[PDB]
Amino acid sequence: HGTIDYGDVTVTGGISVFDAKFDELYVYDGDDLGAVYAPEETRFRLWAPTASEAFVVLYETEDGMPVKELPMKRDVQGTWTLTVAEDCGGLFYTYRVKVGEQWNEAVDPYAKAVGVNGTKTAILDLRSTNPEGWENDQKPPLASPTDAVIYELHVRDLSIHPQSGIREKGKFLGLTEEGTRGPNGIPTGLDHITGLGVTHVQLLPIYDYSQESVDESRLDEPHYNWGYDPQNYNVPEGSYSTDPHNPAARILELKRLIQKLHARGLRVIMDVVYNHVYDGYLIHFTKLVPGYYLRYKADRTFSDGTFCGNECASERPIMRKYIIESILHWVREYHIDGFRFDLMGMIDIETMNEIRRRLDEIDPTILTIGEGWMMETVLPKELRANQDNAEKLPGIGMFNDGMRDAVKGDIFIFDRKGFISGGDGFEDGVKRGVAGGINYGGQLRQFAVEPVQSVNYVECHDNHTLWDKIELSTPGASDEERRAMHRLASAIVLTSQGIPFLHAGQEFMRTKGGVENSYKSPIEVNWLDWERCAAHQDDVSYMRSLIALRKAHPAFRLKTADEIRAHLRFEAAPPHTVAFTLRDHAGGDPDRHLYVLYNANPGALSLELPALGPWEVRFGGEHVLALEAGASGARLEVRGVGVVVLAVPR
Numbered sequence: 001h002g003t004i005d006y007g008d009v010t011v012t013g014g015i016s017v018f019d020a021k022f023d024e025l026y027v028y029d030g031d032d033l034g035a036v037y038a039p040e041e042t043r044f045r046l047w048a049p050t051a052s053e054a055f056v057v058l059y060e061t062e063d064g065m066p067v068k069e070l071p072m073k074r075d076v077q078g079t080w081t082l083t084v085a086e087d088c089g090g091l092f093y094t095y096r097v098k099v100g101e102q103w104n105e106a107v108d109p110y111a112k113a114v115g116v117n118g119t120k121t122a123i124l125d126l127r128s129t130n131p132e133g134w135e136n137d138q139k140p141p142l143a144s145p146t147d148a149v150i151y152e153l154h155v156r157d158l159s160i161h162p163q164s165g166i167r168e169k170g171k172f173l174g175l176t177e178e179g180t181r182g183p184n185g186i187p188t189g190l191d192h193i194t195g196l197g198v199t200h201v202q203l204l205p206i207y208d209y210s211q212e213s214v215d216e217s218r219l220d221e222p223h224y225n226w227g228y229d230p231q232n233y234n235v236p237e238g239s240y241s242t243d244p245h246n247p248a249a250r251i252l253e254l255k256r257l258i259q260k261l262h263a264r265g266l267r268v269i270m271d272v273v274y275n276h277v278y279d280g281y282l283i284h285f286t287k288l289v290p291g292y293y294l295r296y297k298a299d300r301t302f303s304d305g306t307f308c309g310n311e312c313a314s315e316r317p318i319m320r321k322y323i324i325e326s327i328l329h330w331v332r333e334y335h336i337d338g339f340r341f342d343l344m345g346m347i348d349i350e351t352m353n354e355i356r357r358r359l360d361e362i363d364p365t366i367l368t369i370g371e372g373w374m375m376e377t378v379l380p381k382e383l384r385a386n387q388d389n390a391e392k393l394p395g396i397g398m399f400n401d402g403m404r405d406a407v408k409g410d411i412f413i414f415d416r417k418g419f420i421s422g423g424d425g426f427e428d429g430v431k432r433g434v435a436g437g438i439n440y441g442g443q444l445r446q447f448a449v450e451p452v453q454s455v456n457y458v459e460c461h462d463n464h465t466l467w468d469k470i471e472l473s474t475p476g477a478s479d480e481e482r483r484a485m486h487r488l489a490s491a492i493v494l495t496s497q498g499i500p501f502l503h504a505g506q507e508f509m510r511t512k513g514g515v516e517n518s519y520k521s522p523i524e525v526n527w528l529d530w531e532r533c534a535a536h537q538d539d540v541s542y543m544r545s546l547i548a549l550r551k552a553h554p555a556f557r558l559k560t561a562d563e564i565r566a567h568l569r570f571e572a573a574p575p576h577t578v579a580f581t582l583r584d585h586a587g588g589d590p591d592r593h594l595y596v597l598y599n600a601n602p603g604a605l606s607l608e609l610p611a612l613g614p615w616e617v618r619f620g621g622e623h624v625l626a627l628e629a630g631a632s633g634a635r636l637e638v639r640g641v642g643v644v645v646l647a648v649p650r
């Protein structure tokens with residue numbers, strides 16, 4: 001890891017990079033950080049206020065020796081500039097700076113293209129990376145965040161199974177392939193996903209993550225990583241391209257992916273990890289401006305609230321600028337439709353609200369959701385963008401972990417049951433999530449002001465899959481009983497207020513063989529198992545029908561807490577069940593009233609229904625023995641674990 005030299009403070013008037021007054025100097029406000037290429041000339045601008053000298057080092061090959069090094073000129077607000085009056089297309093470059101007595105060399109933090117494994121910046125005209133028709137790329141319409149159905153997917157998982165029927169296995173382009181077929185001729189890949197009716201694909205890290213995670217020069221050897229180890233924030237990951245050595249390939253191919261998804265009616269959410277970098281000692285930030293971009297404790301060690309070694313100092317002005325401009329680059333250059341913020345509670349509220357404001361100026365339908373977990377850091381508590389501060393973060397969704405644990409049981413105590421598996425006392429937790437996590441009334445309240453702030457889920461890339469958690473908590477159960485519990489959990493997600501979130505393969509009861517944290521497990525653990533999918537086409541059709549049910553009923557998709565408090569009523573129901581009505585054409589629903597029963601009781605039950613008119617079955621008729629509407633008391637005869645939905649027609 002070597003020596004870190006924080007600078008000769010006389011360069012900065014005696015003001016140390018750790019000093020509070022440093023944030024008031026060198027606040028560069030320009031739009032031109034990085035390299036601006038043209039055949040005529042390339043202009044470079046680097047922010048490096050503590051350096052006493054700065055150089056652009058040019059390379060002809062990603063692996064070669066320097067062919068030239070050119071001094072930069074100290075410019076305004078701690079920046080350095082250089083323009084090369086030659087056509088620099090096809091060259092690579094780094095910056096070399098002298099900070100204190102140290103000479104450090106680093107990739108441009110604003111790199112838009114890189115060589116293999118991201119060790120040099122690549123110079124190219126990004127307009128040459130646009131797919132044909134990119135100008136006319138248009139997004140599918142989205143009227144509300146509550147209208148999204150998110151499908152969380154890893155690019156390698158999608159296609160790497162040997163029977164996926166996809167040619168470019170493990171690559172961005174594998175998700176562009178239409179008409180792919182798996183075992184028994186079932187649809188796979190893109191056709192499987194569009195056939196589900198989901199609206200957004202949320203991609204696990206597609207920015208460039210570190211060579212230590214996946215070596216982009218050894219792709220002919222087994223490899224796998226989720227990618228939560230950021231190296232170059234503004235360029236795609238090389239291993240997802242057909243040629244990691246061609247700087248343009250990963251860019252063009254990611255754009256081809258996004259274009260195809262948009263044409264097939266899907267939006268794309270990027271999982272972004274601005275809370276930490278792969279290695280706080282080796283990252284370009286620390287080589288170029290040591291001590292500025294990462295968070296330090298009072299004793300000048302890294303704050304490590306992420307448990308990854310370091311935290312990005314989002315609250316300092318140039319890093320806030322970096323993050324915002326990075327997000328805007330993904331929106332503008334790649335047409336991205338949303339962001340999921342890893343460990344969002346490590347990011348400060350001012351930065352998050354500024355991101356949301358800048359995105360709203362461009363397209364307010366762009367989604368922003370994040371992990372709003374309460375986690376210690378040197379960042380003061382009142383500035384953490386987490387659930388405790390959700391009232392200060394309007395428009396930003398957060399994963400509802402209270403709902404998640406109430407439905408399927410505690411994710412950290414593997415054997416513990418929850419609502420679906422017959423545990424006691426989880427009804428109110430489910431009800432809190434049904435209401436979108438808002439302050440609904442009495443003890444039914446969570447962190448959300450508005451339901452657009454609550455993301456509902458029972459599975460994601462983290463922790464056991466829903467199937468694997470059910471198996472660990474239901475030792476006495478048959479696989480048939482477990483499948484019924486699994487289906488019930490998915491139904492709760494898709495009929496709760498807020499934003500529904502599905503893990504890729506949840507539709508076929510995805511298993512990881514009991515592996516809890518699969519971030520670097522082999523492909524045999526992590527792939528989308530299209531054989532299992534082919535054996536679970538009934539369960540896939542069930543998920544498709546649930547998604548269609550939510551689409552048909554805007555009562556499930558209410559945009560405001562005021563609507564939920566006016567139209568949602570919880571009904572009397574026995575233990576191990578939850579029952580509620582969505583009354584009076586909620587949200588523009590075509591039917592007059594809906595009644596929803598979550599039944600976790602495997603036996604027979606006779607339930608009193610609200611006398612709201614001639615109820616008829618809309619979903620889950622397989623559980624309904626009889627339905628009596630009374631004068632039009634009203635009563636429902638049910639058996640077995642699952643969801644039942646009734647409606648009073650207009």
Ligand SMILES: OC[C@H]1O[C@H](O[C@H]2[C@H](O)[C@@H](O)[C@@H](O[C@H]3[C@H](O)[C@@H](O)[C@@H](O)O[C@@H]3CO)O[C@@H]2CO)[C@H](O)[C@@H](O)[C@@H]1O
Pocket residue numbers: 226227228229273307308309342343371462517519
């Ligand atoms: O190499 C540094 C770091 O690697 C390992 O941490 C990994 C986690 O084990 C893994 O689960 C994943 O964690 C991320 C979550 O998936 C994500 O949704 C969110 O909760 O943030 C987490 C971090 O971004 O990825 C990390 C990083 O690769 C290892 O366990 C650590 O001990 C180690 O310090």
Ligand SMILES: OC[C@H]1O[C@H](O[C@H]2[C@H](O)[C@@H](O)[C@@H](O[C@H]3[C@H](O)[C@@H](O)[C@@H](O)O[C@@H]3CO)O[C@@H]2CO)[C@H](O)[C@@H](O)[C@@H]1O
Pocket residue numbers: 306307373374375401462463517
């Ligand atoms: O080494 C760090 C850690 O990273 C990963 O842990 C993540 C959890 O897997 C993930 O569920 C989430 O944990 C949060 C709970 O979901 C939430 O209900 C509440 O309790 O806050 C938790 C975070 O404090 O995020 C963590 C942290 O990234 C990885 O899976 C672990 O193996 C690993 O230890």
Ligand SMILES: OC[C@H]1O[C@H](O[C@H]2[C@H](O)[C@@H](O)[C@@H](O[C@H]3[C@H](O)[C@@H](O)[C@@H](O)O[C@@H]3CO)O[C@@H]2CO)[C@H](O)[C@@H](O)[C@@H]1O
Pocket residue numbers: 537538539541542544545546618619620621622
């Ligand atoms: O579409 C409304 C309908 O959705 C749900 O029914 C699904 C079943 O739960 C699911 O198992 C599957 O069942 C069908 C099989 O795919 C098929 O091979 C054959 O056996 O017919 C079955 C239908 O009886 O697909 C259906 C439809 O997706 C939900 O359970 C119903 O309550 C609801 O009416």
Ligand SMILES: [Ca+2]
Pocket residue numbers: 117118208209210211214216231237238239
């Ligand atoms: Ca990489």
Ligand SMILES: [Cl-]
Pocket residue numbers: 105106107119282283284
């Ligand atoms: Cl670097």
Ligand SMILES: [Cl-]
Pocket residue numbers: 187191192195
């Ligand atoms: Cl199809």
Ligand SMILES: [Cl-]
Pocket residue numbers: 169170171219239240
């Ligand atoms: Cl690969």
Ligand SMILES: [Cl-]
Pocket residue numbers: 278279280281308309310
């Ligand atoms: Cl580190």
Ligand SMILES: [Cl-]
Pocket residue numbers: 373374375376381384386388
């Ligand atoms: Cl906190």
Ligand SMILES: [Cl-]
Pocket residue numbers: 402445446447
């Ligand atoms: Cl809560």
Ligand SMILES: [Cl-]
Pocket residue numbers: 549552618
């Ligand atoms: Cl219906």
